[PDB]
Amino acid sequence: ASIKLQSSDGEIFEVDVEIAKQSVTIKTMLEDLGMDPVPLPNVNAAILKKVIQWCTHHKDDPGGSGTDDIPVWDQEFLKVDQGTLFELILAANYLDIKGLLDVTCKTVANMIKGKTPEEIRKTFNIKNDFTEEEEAQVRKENQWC
Amino acid sequence: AASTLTRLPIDVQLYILSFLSPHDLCQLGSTNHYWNETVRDPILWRYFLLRDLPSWSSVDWKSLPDLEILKKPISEVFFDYMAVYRMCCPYLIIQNEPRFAMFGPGLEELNTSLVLSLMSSEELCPTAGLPQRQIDGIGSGVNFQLNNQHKFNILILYSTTRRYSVIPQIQKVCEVVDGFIYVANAEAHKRHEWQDEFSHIMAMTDPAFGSSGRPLLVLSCISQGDVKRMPCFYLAHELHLNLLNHPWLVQDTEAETLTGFLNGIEWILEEVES
């Protein structure tokens, strides 16, 4: 039950088939053609290694997360560099792994919660871009009761 | 888009946004540009509305969204889902500064101008209506603020009409307004064509326009204190007001002192509610 996964720069990763099908993106390529090696042109090696770790950890359980508290392990798993986090957010989206998407996007969401923005601003390097008077007009308009 | 977070796909950006709350959403929106635009994405709100629609335990007549057949269909194959979210969220009130159409013979026959008194009233902070919408082809109306809380807008129609006969610009007013104000002349010496005025009221209060049971405040009005007055019960009864079966109130008024206006306005505001 062994399947070959080929990084965006070749790389290894011989994972158990149940663990690979966990990505729909893959499960559907494994049905196009036999596909022996499996070319993943978007996910590099560093990232895919994480992706496999996450999948091998949740292999025996899936179902119903969504807006459920991020579990303790995923919390650690995700104590990563910010850019690395977004890189996971893309792999999850590319490999279509719902669970990894939920938990990475939710962790990003939790960062934005409770900021000024001016915090939200520092945190993600976003361009101020409201001219002098532009502010008040959006700030009174964005005061949710 | 120099921001790692701004570059992500919209599908993925909205997914992130799906875990936030309206309050959060506003802070993120305040980063400006894209985020302001995207935080209000019609799609994000559809999702919120569909979710949480099933969590509410009340629905009044004033808040049951159009065909759920329409709320809940294919994304494309309406909105402003954000707005609809608000009417339906029973813990939320959408905001509104009422506007009222003021017309009536009383505006021109009295020897003292009511309008020119309302305009000179320290107590109501009358101020030119801002072009910010509020325009039509008649102007912006005049904003007033009642004792530093409720703000409202009046459109004073000095000439309505040419049976129906409602002028077209006037019908644009009849649809967007929340209530009507009719300035009757209560001066005892005045001869009336009651039937005309009642018709003329009707014409404007026509339900083909903004339908609803919009309130009608009628200001039984005289130039000043010493002028002999037609009692309002008799005035109300001459305009056949019993027939309108939709809220109305005849409030006595004096152009000079505005005696009576403030009670009248208070009534009309309290009538319009949601």
Side-chain angles (χ1 to χ4, degrees), chain A residues 27-113:
Chain A
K27 182 173 74 172
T28 58
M29 287 188 297
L30 290 172
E31 303 176 42
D32 291 326
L33 35 49
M35 220 340 82
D36 311 338
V38 176
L40 286 194
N42 277 358
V43 198
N44 71 21
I47 299 296
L48 213 218
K49 169 173 179 178
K50 274 304 233 322
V51 174
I52 287 154
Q53 194 182 185
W54 188 94
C55 290
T56 61
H57 175 63
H58 292 99
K59 62 168 179 162
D60 286 308
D61 70 48
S65 283
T67 65
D68 211 321
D69 288 332
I70 305 196
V72 292
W73 185 98
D74 295 298
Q75 286 192 208
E76 286 300 315
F77 182 81
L78 294 185
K79 276 162 171 176
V80 120
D81 292 6
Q82 183 169 300
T84 283
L85 175 73
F86 290 104
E87 283 186 66
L88 291 162
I89 291 181
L90 294 167
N93 192 212
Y94 172 65
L95 303 164
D96 186 341
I97 310 191
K98 203 217 169 195
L100 213 197
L101 200 53
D102 282 339
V103 96
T104 46
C105 290
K106 195 173 161 174
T107 30
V108 181
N110 290 333
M111 286 164 53
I112 308 175
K113 285 173 171 159

XYZ file of all heavy atoms in Angstrom, chain A residues 27-113:
673
model
N -5.814 11.784 -4.800
C -6.758 10.697 -5.070
C -7.299 10.734 -6.499
O -7.504 9.681 -7.088
C -7.933 10.702 -4.076
C -8.915 9.557 -4.302
C -9.987 9.451 -3.217
C -11.058 10.546 -3.331
N -12.208 10.317 -2.385
N -7.525 11.924 -7.055
C -8.061 12.039 -8.422
C -6.982 11.838 -9.511
O -7.306 11.418 -10.624
C -8.820 13.374 -8.637
O -7.942 14.482 -8.379
C -10.055 13.445 -7.724
N -5.721 12.143 -9.209
C -4.627 11.866 -10.157
C -4.290 10.375 -10.200
O -3.875 9.851 -11.234
C -3.361 12.620 -9.794
C -3.385 14.082 -10.066
S -1.724 14.675 -9.786
C -1.507 14.334 -8.044
N -4.450 9.709 -9.060
C -4.211 8.285 -8.960
C -5.256 7.507 -9.739
O -5.105 6.302 -9.942
C -4.211 7.847 -7.499
C -3.008 8.351 -6.706
C -3.176 8.043 -5.235
C -1.711 7.740 -7.236
N -6.313 8.194 -10.170
C -7.376 7.577 -10.978
C -7.300 7.992 -12.466
O -7.921 7.342 -13.309
C -8.747 7.885 -10.356
C -8.838 7.412 -8.881
C -10.146 7.780 -8.187
O -11.219 7.654 -8.827
O -10.097 8.160 -6.989
N -6.552 9.063 -12.773
C -6.304 9.488 -14.160
C -5.465 8.411 -14.820
O -5.890 7.761 -15.779
C -5.536 10.823 -14.252
C -6.346 12.035 -13.791
O -7.577 12.058 -13.988
O -5.728 12.993 -13.267
N -4.266 8.230 -14.273
C -3.290 7.250 -14.741
C -2.672 6.550 -13.524
O -2.758 7.072 -12.402
C -2.220 7.924 -15.623
C -1.763 9.358 -15.274
C -1.410 9.515 -13.803
C -0.588 9.789 -16.161
N -2.084 5.369 -13.740
C -1.412 4.633 -12.662
C -0.635 5.635 -11.827
O -0.781 5.689 -10.602
N 0.181 6.438 -12.517
C 0.962 7.544 -11.942
C 2.142 7.208 -10.998
O 2.910 8.100 -10.610
C 0.133 8.322 -10.905
C 0.285 9.837 -10.922
S 1.762 10.484 -11.702
C 1.340 10.470 -13.457
N 2.542 5.925 -10.699
C 3.856 5.537 -10.133
C 4.304 6.841 -9.440
O 3.548 7.330 -8.606
C 4.772 5.076 -11.260
C 4.106 4.081 -12.170
O 3.136 3.428 -11.733
O 4.544 3.966 -13.333
N 5.523 7.390 -9.728
C 5.824 8.703 -9.125
C 4.648 9.673 -9.222
O 3.909 9.594 -10.185
C 6.952 9.226 -10.027
C 7.401 8.010 -10.893
C 6.779 6.822 -10.251
N 4.583 10.726 -8.423
C 3.352 11.546 -8.470
C 3.809 13.000 -8.438
O 4.282 13.470 -7.416
C 2.372 11.290 -7.360
C 1.197 12.268 -7.481
C 1.887 9.875 -7.451
N 3.647 13.722 -9.556
C 4.228 15.033 -9.663
C 3.355 16.075 -9.025
O 2.212 16.253 -9.441
C 4.262 15.251 -11.173
C 3.069 14.476 -11.695
C 2.623 13.538 -10.597
N 3.900 16.727 -8.002
C 3.236 17.797 -7.305
C 4.014 19.075 -7.588
O 4.861 19.486 -6.799
C 3.142 17.503 -5.813
C 2.106 16.448 -5.409
C 1.852 16.477 -3.889
C 0.794 16.638 -6.144
N 3.715 19.709 -8.730
C 4.357 20.933 -9.214
C 4.162 22.208 -8.378
O 4.698 23.249 -8.739
C 3.669 21.146 -10.571
C 2.322 20.551 -10.378
C 2.674 19.277 -9.679
N 3.392 22.170 -7.308
C 3.254 23.379 -6.519
C 3.907 23.291 -5.144
O 4.520 24.263 -4.691
C 1.780 23.764 -6.422
C 1.306 24.537 -7.648
O 2.099 24.817 -8.551
N 0.023 24.909 -7.673
N 3.822 22.119 -4.518
C 4.352 21.905 -3.178
C 5.816 21.575 -3.195
O 6.203 20.591 -3.830
C 3.694 20.701 -2.540
C 3.907 20.747 -1.033
C 2.229 20.677 -2.873
N 6.651 22.347 -2.507
C 8.086 21.992 -2.469
C 8.316 20.774 -1.518
O 7.368 20.079 -1.116
C 8.963 23.208 -2.106
C 8.820 23.640 -0.639
O 8.382 22.856 0.223
N 9.204 24.885 -0.344
N 9.564 20.524 -1.149
C 9.885 19.400 -0.257
C 9.677 19.749 1.210
O 9.158 18.950 1.965
C 11.327 18.930 -0.480
N 10.109 20.938 1.614
C 10.018 21.334 3.004
C 8.591 21.207 3.392
O 8.268 20.503 4.342
C 10.487 22.761 3.204
N 7.743 21.876 2.608
C 6.297 21.928 2.845
C 5.617 20.570 2.750
O 4.866 20.204 3.634
C 5.611 22.820 1.844
C 6.138 24.271 1.945
C 4.112 22.761 2.067
C 5.873 24.995 3.237
N 5.872 19.818 1.688
C 5.223 18.523 1.541
C 5.576 17.631 2.713
O 4.854 16.710 3.013
C 5.659 17.793 0.265
C 4.640 16.897 -0.466
C 5.375 15.678 -0.970
C 3.494 16.436 0.355
N 6.710 17.874 3.352
C 7.138 17.011 4.447
C 6.246 17.298 5.618
O 5.841 16.368 6.350
C 8.606 17.222 4.797
C 9.061 16.559 6.073
C 10.573 16.698 6.222
C 11.069 16.071 7.511
N 12.545 16.138 7.659
N 5.958 18.581 5.807
C 5.014 18.975 6.834
C 3.656 18.360 6.515
O 3.044 17.709 7.356
C 4.865 20.497 6.917
C 5.884 21.208 7.797
C 5.876 20.638 9.263
C 5.689 21.746 10.346
N 6.435 23.020 9.981
N 3.209 18.561 5.281
C 1.918 18.071 4.836
C 1.742 16.584 5.105
O 0.674 16.134 5.457
C 1.729 18.338 3.370
C 0.449 17.701 2.905
C 1.697 19.821 3.149
N 2.791 15.817 4.954
C 2.685 14.398 5.196
C 2.612 14.169 6.663
O 1.966 13.245 7.081
C 3.900 13.640 4.660
C 3.857 13.594 3.130
C 3.928 12.247 5.220
C 5.199 13.446 2.507
N 3.287 14.988 7.457
C 3.297 14.805 8.907
C 1.904 15.071 9.436
O 1.316 14.275 10.170
C 4.305 15.747 9.539
C 4.660 15.444 10.964
C 5.628 16.445 11.579
O 6.052 16.255 12.703
N 5.969 17.514 10.855
N 1.345 16.195 9.022
C 0.004 16.506 9.419
C -0.961 15.356 9.030
O -1.718 14.888 9.863
C -0.430 17.799 8.798
C -1.730 18.249 9.334
C -1.944 19.097 10.366
C -3.001 17.874 8.858
N -3.286 19.271 10.557
C -3.947 18.531 9.627
C -3.431 17.039 7.848
C -5.266 18.372 9.434
C -4.759 16.893 7.659
C -5.657 17.548 8.436
N -0.933 14.909 7.778
C -1.825 13.837 7.341
C -1.575 12.536 8.098
O -2.535 11.823 8.443
C -1.693 13.544 5.834
S -2.306 14.763 4.677
N -0.322 12.195 8.366
C -0.127 10.914 9.033
C -0.620 10.996 10.479
O -0.954 9.979 11.069
C 1.317 10.419 9.020
O 2.115 11.374 9.704
C 1.846 10.250 7.597
N -0.676 12.200 11.035
C -1.172 12.381 12.400
C -2.670 12.251 12.517
O -3.150 11.739 13.517
C -0.787 13.738 12.964
C -1.369 13.995 14.308
N -1.062 13.229 15.401
C -2.246 14.928 14.742
C -1.730 13.671 16.452
N -2.448 14.712 16.081
N -3.404 12.740 11.522
C -4.873 12.676 11.504
C -5.420 11.490 10.727
O -6.610 11.356 10.620
C -5.472 13.954 10.897
C -5.269 15.173 11.732
N -4.270 16.079 11.482
C -5.911 15.615 12.834
C -4.305 17.034 12.390
N -5.296 16.781 13.217
N -4.568 10.616 10.209
C -5.046 9.510 9.376
C -6.238 8.762 9.948
O -7.208 8.537 9.243
C -3.919 8.512 9.080
C -3.301 7.809 10.268
C -2.427 6.654 9.803
C -1.760 5.939 10.972
N -1.261 4.585 10.581
N -6.186 8.416 11.222
C -7.248 7.609 11.827
C -8.346 8.406 12.540
O -8.653 8.080 13.687
C -6.655 6.597 12.846
C -5.933 5.413 12.194
O -6.511 4.733 11.313
O -4.777 5.151 12.594
N -8.978 9.330 11.913
C -10.094 10.072 12.605
C -11.102 10.973 11.818
O -12.292 10.993 12.200
C -9.542 10.937 13.793
C -8.692 12.153 13.350
O -9.086 12.939 12.455
O -7.613 12.342 13.951
N -10.658 11.665 10.725
C -11.421 12.766 10.075
C -12.939 12.886 10.196
O -13.700 11.907 10.050
C -11.044 12.604 8.592
C -9.598 12.345 8.689
C -9.503 11.328 9.860
N -13.320 14.147 10.441
C -14.713 14.557 10.325
C -15.274 15.639 11.232
O -15.216 15.531 12.466
N -15.821 16.684 10.596
C -16.590 17.750 11.272
C -15.937 18.974 11.917
O -16.657 19.766 12.555
N -14.613 19.149 11.768
C -13.916 20.317 12.370
C -14.672 21.619 12.065
O -15.629 21.969 12.780
C -12.430 20.424 11.940
O -11.601 19.494 12.630
N -14.295 22.317 11.016
C -14.881 23.606 10.687
C -14.470 24.578 11.784
O -13.258 24.773 12.004
N -15.465 25.129 12.507
C -15.218 26.100 13.594
C -15.157 25.412 14.979
O -15.765 25.856 15.942
C -16.256 27.333 13.598
O -17.596 26.877 13.886
C -16.246 28.197 12.267
N -14.402 24.330 15.061
C -14.180 23.626 16.301
C -12.819 24.111 16.765
O -11.941 24.383 15.918
C -14.201 22.123 16.049
C -14.709 21.340 17.227
O -14.373 21.694 18.370
O -15.489 20.394 17.006
N -12.608 24.240 18.072
C -11.319 24.739 18.566
C -10.121 24.018 17.933
O -10.106 22.819 17.795
C -11.213 24.588 20.072
C -12.082 25.541 20.830
O -12.383 26.644 20.334
O -12.463 25.170 21.955
N -9.094 24.745 17.550
C -7.928 24.088 16.981
C -7.362 23.153 18.043
O -7.207 23.543 19.175
C -6.838 25.083 16.515
C -7.435 26.109 15.518
C -5.659 24.327 15.950
C -6.412 26.901 14.706
N -7.073 21.904 17.682
C -6.569 21.000 18.674
C -5.160 21.367 19.066
O -4.438 21.931 18.263
C -6.575 19.663 17.940
C -7.482 19.853 16.794
C -7.225 21.228 16.387
N -4.786 21.005 20.291
C -3.465 21.306 20.860
C -2.265 20.946 19.984
O -1.311 21.727 19.907
C -3.253 20.587 22.216
C -4.157 21.162 23.278
C -3.489 19.094 22.066
N -2.301 19.775 19.355
C -1.201 19.310 18.534
C -1.093 20.173 17.300
O 0.003 20.627 16.954
C -1.437 17.864 18.138
C -0.341 17.147 17.370
C 0.605 16.300 17.886
C -0.143 17.155 15.973
N 1.398 15.800 16.892
C 0.968 16.310 15.701
C -0.774 17.803 14.923
C 1.474 16.106 14.404
C -0.300 17.603 13.642
C 0.842 16.752 13.382
N -2.221 20.424 16.638
C -2.195 21.257 15.447
C -1.672 22.616 15.863
O -0.868 23.245 15.140
C -3.558 21.364 14.791
C -4.040 20.032 14.245
O -3.373 19.494 13.364
O -5.070 19.495 14.701
N -2.071 23.071 17.046
C -1.572 24.363 17.465
C -0.019 24.388 17.411
O 0.579 25.303 16.811
C -2.074 24.730 18.836
C -3.488 25.124 18.840
C -3.877 25.756 20.145
O -5.020 25.692 20.537
N -2.922 26.381 20.823
N 0.612 23.397 18.037
C 2.041 23.282 17.965
C 2.446 23.150 16.531
O 3.121 24.010 15.998
C 2.529 22.060 18.729
C 2.456 22.289 20.212
C 3.327 23.471 20.592
O 4.486 23.504 20.064
O 2.825 24.357 21.368
N 1.987 22.097 15.877
C 2.364 21.859 14.492
C 2.472 23.168 13.744
O 3.383 23.385 12.959
C 1.338 20.969 13.817
C 1.669 20.634 12.411
C 2.555 19.634 12.121
C 1.084 21.300 11.374
C 2.859 19.313 10.807
C 1.396 20.980 10.063
C 2.279 19.988 9.785
N 1.532 24.055 14.020
C 1.474 25.340 13.313
C 2.292 26.464 13.925
O 2.304 27.527 13.358
C 0.004 25.779 13.123
C -0.779 24.847 12.188
C -2.162 25.401 11.949
C -0.017 24.614 10.842
N 2.950 26.254 15.060
C 3.861 27.255 15.586
C 5.099 27.180 14.672
O 6.118 26.527 14.944
C 4.156 27.039 17.054
C 3.112 27.637 17.994
C 3.245 27.016 19.371
C 2.415 27.641 20.483
N 2.611 26.806 21.749
N 4.919 27.883 13.560
C 5.805 27.986 12.428
C 6.037 29.447 12.051
O 5.445 30.340 12.684
C 5.134 27.202 11.276
C 4.850 28.075 10.075
C 5.964 25.952 10.915
N 6.919 29.702 11.075
C 7.124 31.062 10.542
C 5.916 31.485 9.741
O 5.311 30.692 9.012
C 8.331 31.145 9.612
C 9.651 30.940 10.323
O 9.620 30.611 11.523
O 10.718 31.107 9.685
N 5.571 32.755 9.824
C 4.375 33.227 9.129
C 4.340 32.854 7.638
O 3.381 32.283 7.133
C 4.239 34.724 9.296
C 2.969 35.249 8.661
C 2.653 36.694 9.019
O 2.480 37.030 10.200
N 2.525 37.550 7.984
N 5.392 33.175 6.926
C 5.445 32.832 5.520
C 5.240 31.345 5.330
O 4.645 30.926 4.331
N 5.723 30.547 6.290
C 5.614 29.086 6.200
C 4.174 28.721 6.360
O 3.699 27.809 5.667
C 6.492 28.299 7.239
O 7.890 28.292 6.837
C 6.005 26.886 7.353
N 3.475 29.449 7.246
C 2.058 29.172 7.488
C 1.277 29.338 6.188
O 0.538 28.433 5.800
C 1.483 30.061 8.601
C -0.030 29.930 8.834
C -0.269 28.608 9.503
C -0.632 31.086 9.632
N 1.474 30.467 5.507
C 0.760 30.719 4.247
C 1.148 29.711 3.233
O 0.323 29.365 2.397
C 0.990 32.131 3.660
C 0.356 33.194 4.458
C 1.096 33.996 5.281
C -0.993 33.335 4.450
C 0.492 34.954 6.052
C -1.598 34.271 5.243
C -0.846 35.087 6.038
N 2.388 29.252 3.277
C 2.765 28.228 2.330
C 1.918 26.964 2.577
O 1.495 26.297 1.632
C 4.261 27.922 2.366
C 5.159 28.947 1.658
C 6.606 28.458 1.626
O 6.878 27.432 0.947
O 7.457 29.051 2.334
N 1.638 26.647 3.831
C 0.761 25.519 4.108
C -0.660 25.804 3.597
O -1.305 24.941 2.971
C 0.776 25.204 5.603
C 2.143 24.641 6.023
C 2.354 24.737 7.507
C 2.245 23.221 5.570
N -1.121 27.028 3.831
C -2.431 27.424 3.370
C -2.587 27.175 1.873
O -3.661 26.795 1.409
C -2.743 28.897 3.753
C -2.925 29.011 5.284
C -4.007 29.444 3.005
C -3.238 30.370 5.756
N -1.519 27.330 1.117
C -1.609 27.092 -0.317
C -1.560 25.619 -0.655
O -2.251 25.177 -1.555
C -0.492 27.832 -1.052
C -0.616 29.360 -0.969
C 0.646 30.048 -1.418
C -1.776 29.793 -1.792
N -0.738 24.860 0.056
C -0.611 23.405 -0.208
C -1.934 22.725 0.059
O -2.401 21.901 -0.713
C 0.524 22.766 0.628
N -2.532 23.112 1.180
C -3.847 22.628 1.556
C -4.851 22.950 0.435
O -5.642 22.136 0.008
C -4.282 23.246 2.863
N -4.798 24.153 -0.059
C -5.667 24.487 -1.122
C -5.282 23.726 -2.401
O -6.152 23.294 -3.137
C -5.598 25.981 -1.335
C -6.664 26.479 -2.225
O -6.455 27.439 -2.947
N -7.825 25.846 -2.185
N -3.996 23.537 -2.672
C -3.595 22.883 -3.912
C -3.885 21.390 -3.889
O -4.348 20.817 -4.867
C -2.101 23.123 -4.197
C -1.543 22.301 -5.380
C -1.999 22.520 -6.686
C -0.547 21.326 -5.196
C -1.502 21.789 -7.751
C -0.043 20.594 -6.268
C -0.529 20.832 -7.531
O -0.054 20.128 -8.609
N -3.606 20.773 -2.753
C -3.756 19.339 -2.574
C -5.153 19.005 -2.139
O -5.510 17.854 -2.029
C -2.777 18.876 -1.515
C -1.328 19.217 -1.857
C -0.426 19.101 -0.638
C -0.860 18.311 -2.956
N -5.944 20.037 -1.912
C -7.323 19.929 -1.433
C -7.431 18.926 -0.248
O -8.019 17.823 -0.343
C -8.283 19.638 -2.587
C -9.729 19.673 -2.166
O -10.015 19.569 -0.964
O -10.599 19.766 -3.046
N -6.835 19.371 0.859
C -6.872 18.695 2.138
C -7.677 19.610 3.093
O -7.143 20.536 3.716
C -5.447 18.405 2.675
C -4.578 17.727 1.595
C -5.532 17.575 3.969
C -3.245 17.169 2.091
N -8.968 19.332 3.220
C -9.860 20.228 3.963
C -9.427 20.494 5.403
O -9.489 21.617 5.886
C -11.314 19.708 3.972
C -12.327 20.873 4.236
C -13.618 20.580 5.120
C -14.244 21.979 5.411
N -15.271 22.127 6.483
N -8.993 19.450 6.081
C -8.620 19.560 7.475
C -7.459 20.477 7.700
O -7.440 21.206 8.663
N -6.495 20.446 6.797
C -5.299 21.255 6.956
C -5.625 22.696 6.642
O -5.016 23.601 7.200
C -4.196 20.772 6.016
C -2.763 20.903 6.504
C -1.850 20.785 5.326
C -2.588 22.193 7.168
N -6.576 22.882 5.717
C -7.050 24.209 5.303
C -7.800 24.833 6.447
O -7.534 25.979 6.817
C -7.965 24.137 4.080
C -8.124 25.441 3.301
C -6.764 26.066 2.911
C -8.923 25.206 2.054
N -8.713 24.071 7.036
C -9.444 24.574 8.187
C -8.493 25.091 9.246
O -8.627 26.238 9.747
C -10.301 23.508 8.881
C -11.594 23.215 8.161
O -12.055 24.069 7.361
O -12.143 22.097 8.413
N -7.520 24.283 9.589
C -6.774 24.634 10.767
C -5.700 25.750 10.484
O -5.335 26.565 11.363
C -6.254 23.321 11.423
C -4.768 22.984 10.998
C -6.444 23.414 12.918
N -5.224 25.820 9.258
C -4.260 26.833 8.950
C -5.014 28.157 8.792
O -4.615 29.183 9.377
C -3.420 26.454 7.711
O -4.256 25.967 6.644
C -2.461 25.366 8.086
N -6.119 28.145 8.040
C -6.856 29.361 7.859
C -7.413 29.840 9.179
O -7.436 31.044 9.413
C -7.982 29.155 6.889
S -7.386 28.928 5.271
N -7.875 28.920 10.037
C -8.401 29.332 11.314
C -7.303 29.976 12.157
O -7.582 30.927 12.859
C -9.086 28.183 12.067
C -9.979 28.762 13.254
C -10.891 27.791 14.060
C -11.260 28.471 15.412
N -12.253 27.789 16.312
N -6.062 29.482 12.100
C -4.961 30.072 12.892
C -4.647 31.472 12.409
O -4.287 32.310 13.224
C -3.656 29.235 12.874
O -3.607 28.557 11.630
C -3.582 28.178 14.034
N -4.786 31.718 11.099
C -4.569 33.050 10.502
C -5.667 33.977 10.978
O -5.405 35.134 11.357
C -4.581 32.996 8.969
C -4.335 34.362 8.356
C -3.526 32.038 8.495
N -6.898 33.448 10.966
C -8.075 34.154 11.455
C -7.849 34.582 12.883
O -8.120 35.714 13.223
C -9.311 33.275 11.365
N -7.307 33.691 13.711
C -7.100 33.997 15.143
C -6.056 35.040 15.394
O -6.016 35.643 16.463
C -6.757 32.738 15.937
C -7.940 31.800 16.066
O -9.106 32.229 16.021
N -7.650 30.515 16.228
N -5.206 35.246 14.411
C -4.217 36.286 14.524
C -4.903 37.631 14.308
O -4.679 38.556 15.085
C -3.066 36.048 13.544
C -2.147 34.905 13.993
S -1.088 34.316 12.679
C -0.367 35.895 12.206
N -5.777 37.718 13.305
C -6.488 38.973 13.023
C -7.467 39.381 14.095
O -7.783 40.535 14.220
C -7.368 38.892 11.762
C -6.592 38.386 10.537
C -7.951 40.238 11.461
C -7.498 38.187 9.314
N -7.995 38.425 14.838
C -8.994 38.743 15.845
C -8.420 39.610 16.923
O -7.373 39.325 17.448
C -9.565 37.475 16.484
C -10.545 36.719 15.614
C -10.929 35.368 16.261
C -12.095 34.664 15.539
N -12.114 33.196 15.831
